[PDB]
Design a protein around this nucleic acid. Structure first.
Ligand SMILES: [Mg+2]
Ligand SMILES: [Mg+2]
Ligand SMILES: [Mg+2]
Ligand SMILES: [Mg+2]
Ligand SMILES: [Mg+2]
Ligand SMILES: [Mg+2]
Ligand SMILES: [Mg+2]
Ligand SMILES: [Mg+2]
Ligand SMILES: [Mg+2]
Ligand SMILES: [Mg+2]
Ligand SMILES: [Mg+2]
Ligand SMILES: [Mg+2]
Ligand SMILES: [Mg+2]
Ligand SMILES: [Mg+2]
Ligand SMILES: [Mg+2]
Ligand SMILES: [Mg+2]
Ligand SMILES: [Mg+2]
Ligand SMILES: [Mg+2]
Ligand SMILES: [Mg+2]
Ligand SMILES: [Mg+2]
Ligand SMILES: [Mg+2]
Ligand SMILES: [Mg+2]
Ligand SMILES: [Mg+2]
Ligand SMILES: [Mg+2]
Ligand SMILES: [Mg+2]
Ligand SMILES: [Mg+2]
Ligand SMILES: [Mg+2]
Ligand SMILES: [Mg+2]
Ligand SMILES: [Mg+2]
Ligand SMILES: [Mg+2]
Ligand SMILES: [Mg+2]
Ligand SMILES: [Mg+2]
Ligand SMILES: [Mg+2]
Ligand SMILES: [Mg+2]
Ligand SMILES: [Mg+2]
Ligand SMILES: [Mg+2]
Ligand SMILES: [Mg+2]
Ligand SMILES: [Mg+2]
Ligand SMILES: [Mg+2]
Ligand SMILES: [Mg+2]
Ligand SMILES: [Mg+2]
Lengths: 41, 64, 77
RNA sequence: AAGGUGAUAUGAACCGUUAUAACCGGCGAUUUCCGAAUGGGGAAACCCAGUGUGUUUCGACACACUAUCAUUAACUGAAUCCAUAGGUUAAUGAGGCGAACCGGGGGAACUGAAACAUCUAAGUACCCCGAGGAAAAGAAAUCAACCGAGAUUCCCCCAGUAG
RNA sequence: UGACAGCCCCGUACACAAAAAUGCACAUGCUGUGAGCUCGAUGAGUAGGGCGGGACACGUGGUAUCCUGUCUGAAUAUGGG
RNA sequence: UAAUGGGUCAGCGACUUAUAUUCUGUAGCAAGGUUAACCGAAUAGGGGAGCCGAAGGGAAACCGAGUCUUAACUGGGCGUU
RNA sequence: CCGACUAAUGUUGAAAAAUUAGCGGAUGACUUGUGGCUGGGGGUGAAAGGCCAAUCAAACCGGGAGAUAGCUGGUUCUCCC
RNA sequence: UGUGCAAACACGAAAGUGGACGUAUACGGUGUGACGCCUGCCCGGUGCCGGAAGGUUAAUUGAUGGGGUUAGCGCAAGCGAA
RNA sequence: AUGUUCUAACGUUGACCCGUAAUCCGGGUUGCGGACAGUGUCUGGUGGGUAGUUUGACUGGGGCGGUCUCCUCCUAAAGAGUAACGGAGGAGCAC
RNA sequence: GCAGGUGCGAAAGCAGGUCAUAGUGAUCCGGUGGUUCUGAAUGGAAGGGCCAUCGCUCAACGGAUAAAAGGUACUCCGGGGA
């Protein structure tokens, strides 16, 4: 899953960075914790 | 309803000019090394259905 | 019922086939799981009974679009 | 319209003959109780209510309302700060029945194969859901064969042919 | 109709008839749905694939095509069936 | 026959029907015959889409009163009168 | 009161399981009234394939249904070759 | 002999329910059948229990080889990338 | 890949709160498990627990025994053919 | 006996297995080689055909399936004095 970090995440990257995470990581943590948003734009 | 052709019969008999039926000879499918060349040669051409069997063949092929 | 709330996938029927081609009736069930979906726009978790395929659909379309489809369909959640 | 008060079915007591006798048609009125049955319950045709009104001669009495679900509103209103869930009220609709035809969800076996398992019977019988006066289908990501056709549906052929 | 009726009776051919309700078909009034027109747009967890089934006259066969329970997964008109 | 069935009577009780196919008879037409659905008020008329027949041989391409077999028949099979 | 070991009778019975003389249990793993629950490859069974409405090695009713029956029975007027 | 409790097990496409508002001195299954004296040898067969080195082995994955097609090389035969 | 740690999916037939007048359910708070368990699709094993079926014929009745195709002789009545669970032998190759 | 090609013989001639009579298995489904005969728009190809050939103690040997043993005294039906 390609996401857009809404903040700095350890091994992931920095705010703005668009990265590919396992769909589970994004759906059950990054997104519900405001730490990222899906790369649709 | 229409009579149904016996399909397996249609794959083994063809009607000739005077109403008889031609067929391929049996015994030329496999084990053939032991069979004499003369015997296999005489099995190659098609043959006519015999009088005894014409009734059976005709019953199987209403639309021939 | 064993119905995906997103896609409408439900059990369907078919045959087991043995090597001897004996046919016996069988069912194919959807890969259903009850999942808590975060709705950022509503600041709420919404639980849906969804197939894995419907999970992928929610990933592709966003939870808001799918919930709107469910509302338009009369499907309560 | 000169007759008439349905039948077994007489009788009785009456109605009527120039037009409110009867009879026939349209539109209306009345339409107990049970039954979806819907105020609650129930061993159908019964038992027992709550609210309003109105009446009482003070004993009482009459009438209307009150099921459930869906949707839409208004008000309200947790855990929990907003809120939501929830609660109540009102509006609108549904419910049940019905012979066949129709679409869909499921779906046999006897039987035939001269036994039997693939195959057959047959997507038939049956169960279930839903609709309409018909339903379904339908305006080519279709065929054709280098020529062309031009949505769907139904009939006759093609053909018991190609497979 | 006391036996078999054109002329006995009721009909029949034919010719007529509605206060009221109602079917349909016309017609033009209220009314909402909005015609023609240029530019533009052209249906994605989809087509397709792997696995299991089912449907196609077609039993997996050398088996196209359709549907999809499961896992995937494009082009998008210069593109696609 | 000491094998079966019937106590008796009356009434009922078992080779049909639809479609396809072949043969016989009969009728029509004849190298031709005949239409289906449908149209039509039409048992008429229209409708020849088709089907069967006048050519066969060969698995087939193909050839054709021939053709197939085979390198080829003195030939042989099926056909032609 | 609950049973049912023996015999006789009865056996188109008084009765589709009884009567008569005897017989066993009789404060218990007893017996009985009312109501309830378990449903057919299913129930229930101190187990006999017992019982599940006089029906049980798969209840009954309706349907598939005119299953199938290489078996048995039966198959109706006359005469001629 | 099974069963550590959301028990084993049973009814049930499931939710659940019985087991049990019980908890190994409990509960299910199996055989034996008061009591007395007892219950011997065999683990090769079948089952069950344990093991896990080595052989064999599913779906899955798709290295490698072969073929069909054809841009082109060719005059033809042919060869032949993606 | 295989360990270990983690929490956020998922489980909870732990606790407490609310809907609520409720040992259902749902929502909240929290603890304990935790990417396991469980479920879907596919797949190997096991599977009389259940189902559909098969289990030949001849035969001095059936069964048990024997036999089942082919060759030679005799029965076979001087052409051919000719039966018995009649009388005697062989083949399913070799080169 | 005819056509083609062949061996032995000087030649006439003989030779299409063996002194003869057993030594065997239909069809289907497929495998291998050859052969443009066919090739679902067309060119190919796949598949099919044709010729040669291979795979059955189908031995119950005209072979019913690719694939099959028992019990019934719990029994049941249709039949036979065959
Ligand atoms: Mg061959
Ligand atoms: Mg009621
Ligand atoms: Mg009521
Ligand atoms: Mg009450
Ligand atoms: Mg049969
Ligand atoms: Mg319509
Ligand atoms: Mg008279
Ligand atoms: Mg489009
Ligand atoms: Mg697909
Ligand atoms: Mg495909
Ligand atoms: Mg497609
Ligand atoms: Mg006598
Ligand atoms: Mg007699
Ligand atoms: Mg008698
Ligand atoms: Mg011809
Ligand atoms: Mg008793
Ligand atoms: Mg007594
Ligand atoms: Mg005593
Ligand atoms: Mg006593
Ligand atoms: Mg017994
Ligand atoms: Mg009884
Ligand atoms: Mg049974
Ligand atoms: Mg039937
Ligand atoms: Mg019958
Ligand atoms: Mg429990
Ligand atoms: Mg004992
Ligand atoms: Mg069995
Ligand atoms: Mg059967
Ligand atoms: Mg026998
Ligand atoms: Mg004997
Ligand atoms: Mg002789
Ligand atoms: Mg003689
Ligand atoms: Mg004789
Ligand atoms: Mg010799
Ligand atoms: Mg010899
Ligand atoms: Mg082509
Ligand atoms: Mg035989
Ligand atoms: Mg046989
Ligand atoms: Mg009997
Ligand atoms: Mg007899
Ligand atoms: Mg006798």
């Amino acid at each position: 899953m390609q996401v857009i970090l809404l903040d700095k995440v350890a091994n992931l990257g920095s705010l703005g960075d668009q990265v590919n995470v396992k769909a589970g990581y994004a759906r059950n943590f990054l997104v519900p914790q405001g730490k990222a948003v899906p790369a649709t734009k | 309803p229409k009579i149904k052709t016996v399909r397996g019969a249609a794959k083994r008999f063809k009607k000739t000019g005077k109403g008889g039926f031609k067929h391929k000879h049996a015994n030329l499918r496999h084990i053939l090394t032991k069979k004499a060349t003369k015997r296999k040669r005489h099995l190659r051409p098609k043959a006519m259905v015999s009088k005894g069997d014409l009734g059976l063949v005709i019953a199987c092929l209403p639309y021939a | 019922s064993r119905v995906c709330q997103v896609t409408g996938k439900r059990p369907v029927t078919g045959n087991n086939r043995s090597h001897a081609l004996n046919a016996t009736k069988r069912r194919f069930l959807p890969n259903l799981h009850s999942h808590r979906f975060w709705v950022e726009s509503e600041k709420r978790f919404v639980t849906l009974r969804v197939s894995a395929k419907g999970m992928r659909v929610i990933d592709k379309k966003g939870i808001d679009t799918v919930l709107a489809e469910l509302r338009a369909r009369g499907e309560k959640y």
